[PDB]
Design a protein around this motif. Structure first.
Motif, mmCIF file in Angstrom:
data_model
loop_
_atom_site.group_PDB
_atom_site.id
_atom_site.type_symbol
_atom_site.label_atom_id
_atom_site.label_comp_id
_atom_site.label_asym_id
_atom_site.label_seq_id
_atom_site.Cartn_x
_atom_site.Cartn_y
_atom_site.Cartn_z
ATOM 1 N N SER A 236 41.684 48.063 39.772
ATOM 2 C CA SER A 236 41.664 47.045 40.817
ATOM 3 C C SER A 236 43.074 46.536 41.115
ATOM 4 C CB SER A 236 40.739 45.871 40.441
ATOM 5 O OG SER A 236 39.421 46.303 40.157
ATOM 6 N N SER A 237 43.997 47.458 41.350
ATOM 7 C CA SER A 237 45.355 47.093 41.747
ATOM 8 C C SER A 237 45.592 47.324 43.245
ATOM 9 C CB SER A 237 46.387 47.853 40.900
ATOM 10 O OG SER A 237 46.286 49.262 41.056
ATOM 11 N N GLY A 238 44.935 48.337 43.810
ATOM 12 C CA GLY A 238 45.139 48.723 45.209
ATOM 13 C C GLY A 238 45.892 50.035 45.323
ATOM 14 N N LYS A 239 46.361 50.547 44.187
ATOM 15 C CA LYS A 239 47.092 51.811 44.146
ATOM 16 C C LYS A 239 46.401 52.933 44.942
ATOM 17 C CE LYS A 239 45.232 52.991 39.543
ATOM 18 N NZ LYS A 239 44.019 52.129 39.653
ATOM 19 N N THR A 240 45.091 53.094 44.766
ATOM 20 C CA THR A 240 44.374 54.162 45.458
ATOM 21 C C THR A 240 44.381 53.900 46.956
ATOM 22 O OG1 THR A 240 42.865 54.257 43.544
ATOM 23 C CG2 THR A 240 42.360 55.667 45.419
ATOM 24 N N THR A 241 44.118 52.655 47.337
ATOM 25 C CA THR A 241 44.179 52.252 48.739
ATOM 26 C C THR A 241 45.506 52.677 49.360
ATOM 27 O OG1 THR A 241 42.617 50.396 48.658
ATOM 28 C CG2 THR A 241 44.382 50.253 50.290
ATOM 29 N N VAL A 242 46.607 52.325 48.698
ATOM 30 C CA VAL A 242 47.935 52.695 49.187
ATOM 31 C C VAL A 242 48.027 54.204 49.407
ATOM 32 C CG1 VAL A 242 50.386 52.848 48.656
ATOM 33 C CG2 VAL A 242 49.156 50.745 48.158
ATOM 34 N N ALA A 243 47.560 54.966 48.417
ATOM 35 C CA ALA A 243 47.583 56.428 48.473
ATOM 36 C C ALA A 243 46.821 56.952 49.685
ATOM 37 C CB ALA A 243 47.004 57.013 47.195
ATOM 38 N N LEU A 244 45.650 56.375 49.939
ATOM 39 C CA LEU A 244 44.804 56.828 51.039
ATOM 40 C C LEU A 244 45.420 56.584 52.416
ATOM 41 C CD1 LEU A 244 41.339 55.734 49.684
ATOM 42 C CD2 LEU A 244 42.231 58.071 49.747
ATOM 43 N N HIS A 245 46.281 55.577 52.536
ATOM 44 C CA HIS A 245 47.008 55.362 53.789
ATOM 45 C C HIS A 245 48.042 56.432 54.034
ATOM 46 C CE1 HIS A 245 45.582 51.625 55.553
ATOM 47 N NE2 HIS A 245 45.410 51.183 54.320
ATOM 48 N N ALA A 246 48.773 56.822 52.995
ATOM 49 C CA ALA A 246 49.655 57.972 53.124
ATOM 50 C C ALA A 246 48.815 59.124 53.645
ATOM 51 C CB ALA A 246 50.302 58.335 51.798
ATOM 52 N N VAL A 247 47.662 59.352 53.014
ATOM 53 C CA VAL A 247 46.749 60.424 53.428
ATOM 54 C C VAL A 247 46.334 60.278 54.891
ATOM 55 C CG1 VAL A 247 44.481 61.489 53.083
ATOM 56 C CG2 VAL A 247 45.877 60.887 51.121
ATOM 57 N N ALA A 248 45.908 59.079 55.285
ATOM 58 C CA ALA A 248 45.520 58.809 56.681
ATOM 59 C C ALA A 248 46.672 59.022 57.677
ATOM 60 C CB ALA A 248 44.963 57.399 56.820
ATOM 61 N N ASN A 249 47.853 58.506 57.347
ATOM 62 C CA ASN A 249 49.021 58.658 58.210
ATOM 63 C C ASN A 249 49.476 60.105 58.320
ATOM 64 O OD1 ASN A 249 49.914 55.963 59.210
ATOM 65 N ND2 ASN A 249 49.918 55.482 57.020
ATOM 66 N N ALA A 250 49.427 60.824 57.201
ATOM 67 C CA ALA A 250 49.764 62.247 57.167
ATOM 68 C C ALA A 250 48.884 63.006 58.141
ATOM 69 C CB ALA A 250 49.589 62.806 55.764
ATOM 70 N N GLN A 251 47.593 62.699 58.111
ATOM 71 C CA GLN A 251 46.630 63.300 59.025
ATOM 72 C C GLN A 251 46.889 62.864 60.458
ATOM 73 O OE1 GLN A 251 43.106 61.809 57.034
ATOM 74 N NE2 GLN A 251 42.547 63.873 56.347
ATOM 75 N N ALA A 252 47.120 61.562 60.638
ATOM 76 C CA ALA A 252 47.343 60.967 61.963
ATOM 77 C C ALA A 252 48.416 61.711 62.755
ATOM 78 C CB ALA A 252 47.704 59.490 61.831
ATOM 79 N N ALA A 253 49.436 62.203 62.054
ATOM 80 C CA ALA A 253 50.495 63.000 62.667
ATOM 81 C C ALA A 253 50.151 64.494 62.697
ATOM 82 C CB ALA A 253 51.802 62.778 61.917
ATOM 83 N N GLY A 254 48.861 64.822 62.681
ATOM 84 C CA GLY A 254 48.411 66.216 62.746
ATOM 85 C C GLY A 254 48.585 67.038 61.476
ATOM 86 N N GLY A 255 48.752 66.360 60.341
ATOM 87 C CA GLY A 255 48.921 67.031 59.051
ATOM 88 C C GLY A 255 47.603 67.254 58.333
ATOM 89 N N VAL A 256 47.643 68.080 57.287
ATOM 90 C CA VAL A 256 46.462 68.412 56.489
ATOM 91 C C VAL A 256 46.613 67.892 55.067
ATOM 92 C CG1 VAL A 256 45.202 70.306 55.388
ATOM 93 C CG2 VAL A 256 45.807 70.429 57.822
ATOM 94 N N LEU B 91 49.956 72.348 53.804
ATOM 95 C CA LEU B 91 49.551 71.022 53.369
ATOM 96 C C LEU B 91 50.658 69.988 53.556
ATOM 97 C CD1 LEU B 91 46.683 71.019 51.877
ATOM 98 C CD2 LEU B 91 48.001 69.929 50.041
ATOM 99 N N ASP B 92 50.339 68.879 54.218
ATOM 100 C CA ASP B 92 51.287 67.773 54.346
ATOM 101 C C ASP B 92 51.277 66.851 53.129
ATOM 102 O OD1 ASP B 92 51.880 68.813 56.872
ATOM 103 O OD2 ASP B 92 52.044 66.806 57.766
ATOM 104 N N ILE B 93 50.115 66.626 52.534
ATOM 105 C CA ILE B 93 50.043 65.757 51.366
ATOM 106 C C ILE B 93 48.971 66.216 50.391
ATOM 107 C CG2 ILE B 93 48.477 64.158 52.548
ATOM 108 C CD1 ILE B 93 49.938 61.915 50.916
ATOM 109 N N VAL B 94 49.198 65.939 49.112
ATOM 110 C CA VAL B 94 48.182 66.145 48.083
ATOM 111 C C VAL B 94 48.211 64.987 47.088
ATOM 112 C CG1 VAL B 94 49.792 67.780 46.995
ATOM 113 C CG2 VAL B 94 47.444 67.573 46.132
ATOM 114 N N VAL B 95 47.045 64.388 46.869
ATOM 115 C CA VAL B 95 46.905 63.256 45.971
ATOM 116 C C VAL B 95 46.170 63.720 44.723
ATOM 117 C CG1 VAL B 95 46.165 60.861 45.774
ATOM 118 C CG2 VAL B 95 46.680 61.817 48.011
ATOM 119 N N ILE B 96 46.634 63.265 43.561
ATOM 120 C CA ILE B 96 46.014 63.594 42.288
ATOM 121 C C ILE B 96 45.476 62.307 41.689
ATOM 122 C CG2 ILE B 96 46.367 64.522 39.967
ATOM 123 C CD1 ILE B 96 48.787 65.380 42.755
ATOM 124 N N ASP B 97 44.162 62.238 41.508
ATOM 125 C CA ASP B 97 43.523 61.045 40.972
ATOM 126 C C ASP B 97 42.661 61.438 39.774
ATOM 127 O OD1 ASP B 97 42.839 58.367 40.822
ATOM 128 O OD2 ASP B 97 41.443 58.419 42.506
#
Length: 311
Positions: free
Chosen positions: A67-87, A136-142
């Motif tokens: 419950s820090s928000g770390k994952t939330t932050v990560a998902l925005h990178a993911v969303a923005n990466a996609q928003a610019a046509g990335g995968v 791939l524009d981004i990859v998240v490891i959780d």
């Protein structure tokens, strides 16, 4: 004094050459601005990062408590990466992901690659394969902690090989990332040693105080410190709001930074911009900027320009 500057300039250049750019920095130095970065969702954090977002082709750590928000932050990178046509891709050893939440941050979940690996090595291998694709524009490891090595899952004395697993992998991966220009984000939970040194950015994420809508709680004020930053002077920190079910208030961060930069001005509780008014109290101003994307963008446009912008 006159020779000193020549000698120090030399030393910095040798250092900058013999190892990477960003091997040494004055903390007041202006940031070297890349062509593309990954916006974080918060302009405050973007500024704290110096380069207006997360670097491409690098290893990134985001860590904090549950419950820090770390994952939330990560998902925005993911969303923005996609928003610019990335995968984007998501390697999942936690099984906690909420795609409904993710969708409301702006993640195209439908097109998000996901893997739920058996072992730690498998996780990093799949990452590596997915990286070397260069698609791939981004990859998240959780997450890091959940990367349990094959040998331990089978029962097979040699305890502490989860670090050698990371070390070996990160070496191989760090090179793969640089060529492709893919970013890797490792979410890591506080409660490893290699990731600290391979990572170009490290972000310490924390929950500060809970935002309250009268009697009920609508979110949390989040704080992030860039404890390590090889792309710009480190130790910077940003604060922003994560709103339950909505995520990071881009609008709330625009105002925060707007006033900080004097581009937004106060008349008591009234927030003004260029003569027009935005609202009484932060909530109305926030709410005004979401209804008016054009003015919110104009403020975002201006904040970047008055510093180093991405555009």
């Amino acid at each position: 004094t006159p020779d000193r500057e020549k000698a120090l300039e030399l030393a910095v250049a040798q250092i900058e050459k013999s190892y990477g750019k960003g091997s040494v920095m004055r903390l007041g130095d202006e940031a070297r601005q890349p062509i593309s970065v990954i916006p974080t969702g918060s302009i405050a954090l973007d500024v704290a990062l110096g380069i207006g977002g997360l670097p491409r082709g690098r290893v990134i750590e985001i860590y904090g408590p549950e419950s820090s928000g770390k994952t939330t932050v990560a998902l925005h990178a993911v969303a923005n990466a996609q928003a610019a046509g990335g995968v984007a891709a998501f390697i999942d050893a936690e099984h906690a992901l909420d795609p409904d939440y993710a969708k409301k941050l702006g993640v195209d979940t439908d097109s998000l690659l996901v893997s739920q690996p058996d072992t730690g090595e498998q996780a990093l291998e799949i990452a590596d394969m997915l990286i070397r694709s260069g698609a791939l524009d981004i990859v998240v490891i959780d997450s890091v902690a959940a990367l349990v090595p094959r040998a331990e899952l089978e029962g097979e004395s040699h305890v502490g090989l989860q670090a050698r697993l990371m070390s070996q992998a990160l070496r191989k991966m760090t090179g793969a990332l640089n060529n492709s220009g893919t970013t890797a984000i490792f979410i890591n939970q506080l409660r490893g040693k290699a990731l600290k040194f391979y990572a170009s950015v490290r972000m310490d994420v924390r929950r500060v105080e809970t935002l309250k809508d009268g009697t009920n709680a609508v979110g949390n004020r989040t704080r992030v410190k860039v404890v390590k930053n090889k792309c710009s002077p480190p130790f910077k920190q940003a604060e922003f709001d994560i709103l339950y079910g909505k995520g990071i208030s881009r609008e709330g961060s625009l105002i925060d930074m707007g006033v900080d930069q004097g581009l937004i001005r106060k008349s008591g509780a009234w927030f003004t911009y260029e003569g027009e008014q935005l609202g009484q109290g932060k909530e109305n101003a926030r709410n005004f900027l979401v209804e008016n994307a054009d003015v919110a963008d104009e403020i975002e446009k201006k904040i970047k320009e008055k510093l180093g912008i991405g555009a």
